[PDB]
């Protein structure tokens, strides 16, 4: 199995809210589809139903927070455990040059529905940018993604 810290759980609660935009406590196929399409993906209704099905333990058709936590607590089955984090980084690093620019970060924040002013987005870059080049490389991304 696995065990999550209270901090990790709180972080996942915030992530959950980006899917559950109406705040009703559940993620519907429509809500999951909306986020994925905003990020450039194109899941079919059948695929969305399958994704929901995987974690929909009670089978009520939607994903609630407890089920979301299980998703985030499942251990990786892919031999190389870091690909998931590298793939996430590539979503932010739009032009794939290895560094997330403020422009690229603003775009992903907007796509995810994370409403932030340009100034707030610069504060994110500043927190992650340890070497001071004004952008965020993979290593810096890893560090700000760490729960502790």
């Amino acid at each position: 199995a696995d065990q999550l810290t209270d901090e990790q759980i709180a972080e996942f609660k915030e992530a959950f809210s980006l899917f559950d935009k109406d705040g009703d406590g559940t993620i519907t196929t429509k809500e999951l589809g909306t986020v994925m399409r905003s990020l450039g993906q194109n899941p079919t209704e059948a695929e969305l139903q399958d994704m929901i099905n995987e974690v929909d333990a009670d089978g009520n058709g939607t994903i609630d927070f407890p089920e979301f936590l299980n998703l985030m607590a499942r251990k990786m089955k892919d031999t190389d455990s870091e690909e998931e984090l590298k793939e996430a980084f590539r979503v932010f690093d739009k032009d794939g040059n290895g560094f997330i620019s403020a422009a690229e970060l603003r775009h992903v924040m907007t796509n995810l529905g994370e409403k932030l002013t340009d100034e707030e987005v610069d504060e994110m870059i500043r927190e992650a940018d340890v070497d001071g080049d004004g952008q965020v490389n993979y290593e810096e991304f890893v560090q700000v993604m760490m729960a502790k």
Binding site: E14, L32, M145
Partner: peptide
């Protein structure tokens, strides 16, 4: 870090729910 974790984990959640 919450802004990075909130968004980064949302991206990761999608990755786990879907195949690559």
């Amino acid at each position: 870090r919450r802004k990075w974790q909130k968004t980064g984990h949302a991206v990761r959640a999608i990755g786990r729910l879907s195949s690559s």
